[PDB]
């Protein structure tokens, strides 16, 4: 092992243990992290909206890793909703956490989640816009499940991504958060290292098509248009500045939301190598004494 502490991967995307139905969440990432000389464990969590409850499940898994390895701490690496569970464990039990790495994390909420909830009230939004948010969401759910899913079967899980919901969490566990919109947070807080990286897409509907992409990436293109604040800087589910946590290694990579975890099945829709970012991060953690 090149690292002093093991790595625990934390998934968190609308309650899916695996993408497409069979494909592992962090596709080809565990094998790559191990190839860099690191011990990797995949956290098993339940589809909950409470990051405190999901965090407790993560806390249990971490203590099981420590029992098997004999290590004092672990390096937390989470995706999307994942980092929120990581931030909880680091806040309540910093003595067990060496570092918290956020990958396209929903650290300040999702503008997509704020839009879809408004489509439940007939009249709150223009009918065309409301149907567009529900249609794209249904396309996302179907791709993630690998089978036809109605958007109403994923609304509850999407509620956990709202700006109001995350803001309540942030006010209770603000460790590592930026002091200003677009800025960075402290790299080292209470003996815990905080890192983050994310991506944005360069998609113009008037010049770029979407007939050669998997429906999983197509949904990202549709939602990126429906962004209100970070309209020209998001990965399809979370804006660039919304994903900042601790030291921002880079939040403007060429990745959509599912590109960050090498989906679908290694077939990314953009230019940035997702796996290499994880590999290079191993060297970063190693040089920090982690």
Automatic annotation (TrEMBL):
Question: Which superkingdom, per the lineage?
Answer: Bacteria
Keyword Hydrolase annotated = yes
Question: What EC number(s) has UniProt assigned to this enzyme?
Answer: 3.1.1.3
Keyword field: Hydrolase
Q: EC class of this enzyme? A: hydrolase
Name of the protein: Lipase
Species this protein is from: uncultured bacterium
